[PDB]
Amino acid sequence: GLKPEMIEKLNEQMNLELYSSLLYQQMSAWCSYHGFEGAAAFLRRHAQEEMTHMQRLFDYLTDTGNLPRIDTIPSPFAEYSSLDELFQETYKHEQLITQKINELAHAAMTNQDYPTFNFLQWYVAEQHEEEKLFKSIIDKLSLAGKSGEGLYFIDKELSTLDT
Amino acid sequence: GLKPEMIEKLNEQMNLELYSSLLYQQMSAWCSYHGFEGAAAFLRRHAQEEMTHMQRLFDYLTDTGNLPRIDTIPSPFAEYSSLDELFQETYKHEQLITQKINELAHAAMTNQDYPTFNFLQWYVAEQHEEEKLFKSIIDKLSLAGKSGEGLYFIDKELSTLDT
Amino acid sequence: GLKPEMIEKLNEQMNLELYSSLLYQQMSAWCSYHGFEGAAAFLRRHAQEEMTHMQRLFDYLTDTGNLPRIDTIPSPFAEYSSLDELFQETYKHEQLITQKINELAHAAMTNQDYPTFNFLQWYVAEQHEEEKLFKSIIDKLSLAGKSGEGLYFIDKELSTLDT
Amino acid sequence: GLKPEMIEKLNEQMNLELYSSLLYQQMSAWCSYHGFEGAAAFLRRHAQEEMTHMQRLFDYLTDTGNLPRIDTIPSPFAEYSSLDELFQETYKHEQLITQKINELAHAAMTNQDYPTFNFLQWYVAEQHEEEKLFKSIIDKLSLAGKSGEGLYFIDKELSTLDT
Amino acid sequence: GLKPEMIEKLNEQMNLELYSSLLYQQMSAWCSYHGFEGAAAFLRRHAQEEMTHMQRLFDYLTDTGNLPRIDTIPSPFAEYSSLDELFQETYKHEQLITQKINELAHAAMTNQDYPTFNFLQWYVAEQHEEEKLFKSIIDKLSLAGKSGEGLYFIDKELSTLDT
Amino acid sequence: GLKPEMIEKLNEQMNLELYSSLLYQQMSAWCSYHGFEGAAAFLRRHAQEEMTHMQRLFDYLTDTGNLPRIDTIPSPFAEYSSLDELFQETYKHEQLITQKINELAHAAMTNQDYPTFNFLQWYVAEQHEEEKLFKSIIDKLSLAGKSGEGLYFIDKELSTLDT
Amino acid sequence: GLKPEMIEKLNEQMNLELYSSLLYQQMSAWCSYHGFEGAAAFLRRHAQEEMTHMQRLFDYLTDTGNLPRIDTIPSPFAEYSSLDELFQETYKHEQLITQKINELAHAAMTNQDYPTFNFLQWYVAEQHEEEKLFKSIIDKLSLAGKSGEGLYFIDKELSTLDT
């Protein structure tokens, strides 16, 4: 079964995924407020995606006969100076999630927890893909984001980015 | 536009819908832990439903040019003595949500806010339906929930209840 | 190629999967004899499933140019006091198989045998699913198995459980 | 109902069918090890066929309210000097199974057990067909099996023989 | 991100996959020159396969923000005494690739690089399959390759082997 | 048959096509590294195209009973100051390939090698088309490539250019 | 229009194609007589193919307002010591046809006859393909043609070779 360190780290990551989903929702509100409807739509879709990462951890914990515990969730509210600054923060947050998944994989390996190591492989692969997506948005903003016209085009791309 | 009281009450209800979704998720974990997989599945579906109520309020606020603000969310964790006690609490919580929606409708009418009164009609109708559903579950538990066999049948019904 | 410890442990697990398939067949005979036709059908299906786990190990060994060796198989015959006692034993046996797979994964990692570690990931995932299934049956028996009526319903569910 | 001699002989044949299935599996491993992949595939298919003969006896015993008992199964491991020697042994084993079925049919007739005599007719017919198949393979090996080229062609035929 | 040892080993393997693709192309030319058109077609298909292994590594490096670097590629030209000698060399080369992939997986594990360990699992599985294929060709040549007639049949099989 | 000068020039062009394919691959890596994903995708597709030109020469040589010889391939690695500079170099390289094809056609005509002159006509026509494509990209960069916004649009066009 | 040398060479080649078709027919009769029905069928198909080459020249001459003239055709009858000797002669004859086509292409170029040079390109390409086909048959006979069994397999392949 799951060792106490692993139960703790899995619950911690479940709650971080929940917080992250709400952070992406709040960021989408910043985008709507500042007239970036396409960026807002993209971040709403990503908020839904990250909530499914929360659910996958929740269900793994219940499968193993452990009771997942949703923690107090701090407010994700923040101020952003620009669309570029916001997406820089989204990318840094995704890098944090990737790091915490790698730390969880390392904990599973050092605890000789092969079921949890196997379970975490989905997160390792998916975080690789999501980091690549957010890096591409950062690159687009670096290239064309220094004018209102460029931001207009990037926003329109974001409205349908990743289907 | 929206008056300050209405902005405050709409944000408050948005955050209550978010809390409620997580409460239903946590209740589903109690059900899984105690072997009621059908009740767990039903509560997971209802958690998803209530999150859409949160999203509808979030989007109304952004439509009106107001910035919705996700608050600190308290932990929904609680202990329950029985499946019946849990569902009694779910029903009481739905009654609370219904009351808060009625208070919001009254606030809209007294503030002469006809767009918000119109927007809230969806919640009035939907809460009526959801209360009816949870009352029916309470009635089933009152009738047949006093044996393990009866709980087995009710759990199986819950696994597919409301599609 | 495969180190001697790994050849030995893989052959051992292949023979344990074979024994397990026959154990589940024998348990199904107990169920038929005591009038639990649905439980019997379920255990016959699971006996077929576990035999495929044997075959997957057999084929891995032959792929690597090693000769798998089917051992002497002890009789799986046993007495059971009740359907609940039988399924408790089935679940404990599945937990044993899960443990032996985890020990094999650990042996592969400590022997720096990355092909075998990769091969074993299928077993880690599948054993997780099968343990969850047998835990759910134990939970149903704990809830409703204390009457002949309840056993009648559980048997009927088992007749088609997991398709 | 079944007389004690008939219960004993039916259980004996059930266990012989089980042993035979594993013997054919082990023979397929010899074929894989020596590079005869088509012969290996054929023997794996025949191992599955013979296991169904075991299951048919198991189910007949349970139908009649008798508890079939899976015995200790001796290891089928053996050495073979050639593909021809292996298939000679497979054919001799099938002839043994045919003889034991004929002895069972005779026992049913002398015990005035008409349900078991009727049940055994399936085995009489099927063993006739399977002996014919293995005799044809022996004949092919006698004709063309004295060269590596001939063995190559026979192996390729075996890979799809009997669909 | 990727540690310097891992960047170096990944680039090294990318270039080894590129060299291998060209080696298989050159071997196919030997086959064409000596009249083995089916062997030539098979090796051309395998050259295309191995180039895709190069591309997968190239793309992983670019995904991680590292610049893959195609090295100077030595000529793969060699002399072969026979079709059997050529395919023995192809099989030994595939075994080398398998070893280098295992060394890369070990480096990822010892460097606590879980994204790269995950990425490499595709190579571990695929190399297992490709080694099995080339071992089967070696076995066919050992059996039937000692006559011109046998080589004729093996060449015809190779023309469509593995679709 | 082929005269020695023609064998030499055909092998030389085969190896130049191979080098060119890898050069286009390496250029695509520069594009990925600098955030031009559409340019990267276009150059990856063109790398695949040019490899087919290599294969067509390889197969012509083998058809004529000559053994094509893959040479040592120098590293294509280079530095580029800008996307425009990179594509200027791609266009100049395509012009070099066109020139070498024209020199080969002239060599075939002066050697009275009508089969090789006929074979080369495919390259004459295809190089005409590919030069036209790369000239059009140069023209787009000259027109709109002097801003980050313009480069953003050109990159997006390149992502699907020439299907 | 056509110069006298070109009219003469085109008529000469038309008559050589006619003779060749009949030669292939006569060779097919040798094959039938010696029991090689598949080789006979292949040569009958090739006789039909070569007659179409005759017709294409005939029609070119009539298109240009020149009267093609079918010459006296010498008997193609010959003796052959073996199927291999026959196909060696077929291949040498195809090489002769290829040479005469190259001489015709050279004559067209030196006579500045660009319509005839264009017309002949079909023959240059087609003769390349047909030489490759007959070289492959020679290679099969060299490999497997030294036994009656091998000749049996080659004959069976020829029966459907090139559709």
Can you describe what's shown?
This is part of a larger assembly, with 7 copies of chain A (163 residues). The first copy, chain A, has 5 helices and no strands. With 163 residues, the first copy, chain A, is mostly helical. In chain A, helix 4 (114-144) packs antiparallel against helix 5. The termini of chain A are far apart. The A-B interface holds A 18, 22, 25-26, 29-30, 32-33, 40, 51, 58, 61-62, 65, 67-77 and B 18, 22, 25-26, 29-30, 32-33, 40, 51, 58, 61-62, 65, 67-77.
Q: Beta-sheet strand percentage of chain A?
A: under 5%
Largest interface: A-B, 25 and 25 residues
Number of strands of chain A: 0
Number of helices of chain A: 5
Q: Describe the oligomeric state of these chains in a short phrase.
A: part of a larger assembly
* Cα distance spanning the termini of chain A: 39 Å
Biggest beta sheet attributes of chain A: none
Shape of chain A: elongated
Helix content of chain A: over 70%
Give the class of chain A from helix and strand content and strand pairing. mainly alpha
**C-alpha Rg of chain A (nearest Å):** 17 Å
Can you write the helix and strand succession of chain A as a string? HHHHH
Binding site for Fe cation 2 (chains A, B, C, D, E, F, G): 50, 94, 127, 130
Subunit structure (chains A, B, C, D, E, F, G): Homooligomer of 24 subunits that assemble into a spherical protein shell (12 +/- 1 nM diameter) that can sequester at least 2000 iron atoms.
Function (chains A, B, C, D, E, F, G): Iron-storage protein.
Binding site for Fe cation 1 (chains A, B, C, D, E, F, G): 17, 50, 53
